[PDB]
Amino acid sequence: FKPEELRQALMPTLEALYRQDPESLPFRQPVDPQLLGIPDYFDIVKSPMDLSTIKRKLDTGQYQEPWQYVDDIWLMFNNAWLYNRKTSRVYKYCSKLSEVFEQEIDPVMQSL
Ligand SMILES: CO[C@H]1CC[C@H](n2c([C@@H]3CCCC(=O)N3c3ccc(F)c(F)c3)nc3cc(-c4c(C)noc4C)ccc32)CC1
Ligand code: NI
Ligand code: NI
Ligand code: NI
Ligand code: NI
Ligand code: NI
Ligand code: NI
Numbered sequence: 001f002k003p004e005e006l007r008q009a010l011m012p013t014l015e016a017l018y019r020q021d022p023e024s025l026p027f028r029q030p031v032d033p034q035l036l037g038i039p040d041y042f043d044i045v046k047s048p049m050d051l052s053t054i055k056r057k058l059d060t061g062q063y064q065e066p067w068q069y070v071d072d073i074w075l076m077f078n079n080a081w082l083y084n085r086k087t088s089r090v091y092k093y094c095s096k097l098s099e100v101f102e103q104e105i106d107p108v109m110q111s112l
Contacts (some may be wrong), residue, residue, distance in 0.1 A: 001112075003061040009112055010069050011058060013104040017051060017073075020100055023093035027051050027076060044083050049076040066112050073101055 018024050030050045033041035042048070054072050063069040077098045084091040 001065050003064070006063065006066065006112075007058055007061070009108055010063065010066060013101065013108055014051065014055060014058065016100055016104045017097050020093075020097055023096040023100075024051065026090050026093060027080070027097065031079075041083060045079045047075060047079070049079060051076070066109060070105065070109075073105075074098075077101075 018028065028051050030048055030053065031041060031045070033039060049072050054069070054076065057063060057072065058069065063072075077094050080090055080094040084094070
């Protein structure tokens with residue numbers, strides 16, 4: 001896997017997430033527990049992940065192969081499904097992003 005060519009295949013699936021409005025809005029920056037006043041967040045969520053961090057990882061070439069990228073995307077989703085209640089807007093928005101992601105990523109993984 002050449003990093004620039006891998007980035008060209010993976011990045012459209014990240015943009016597809018960012019395009020989701022409002023559903024990507026809680027995911028575009030790292031969760032800020034001090035601003036949101038949720039001091040238990042880093043207790044429950046051991047490994048934070050968000051779209052901005054995944055973008056930087058993609059841009060800088062830290063994904064050697066596509067399943068590490070998939071793994072971080074799902075970590076983002078999984079953190080929010082763990083921390084947030086099923087009835088909450090963030091949780092529902094998370095499920096929406098995951099639905100978009102599976103639609104986007106499956107053709108890309110098969111082409112890779
Ligand atoms: C500047 O952009 C705004 C900042 C406030 C944000 N916000 C909000 C605000 C505050 C409360 C009321 C509300 O409805 N919010 C909100 C706002 C926009 C959304 F798209 C959304 F789904 C929820 N709640 C957030 C929750 C989380 C979160 C994630 C992801 N994982 O664990 C937690 C906790 C992250 C952000 C939240 C939503 C986007
Ligand atoms: Ni593009
Ligand atoms: Ni939408
Ligand atoms: Ni390499
Ligand atoms: Ni993982
Ligand atoms: Ni598409
Ligand atoms: Ni699938």
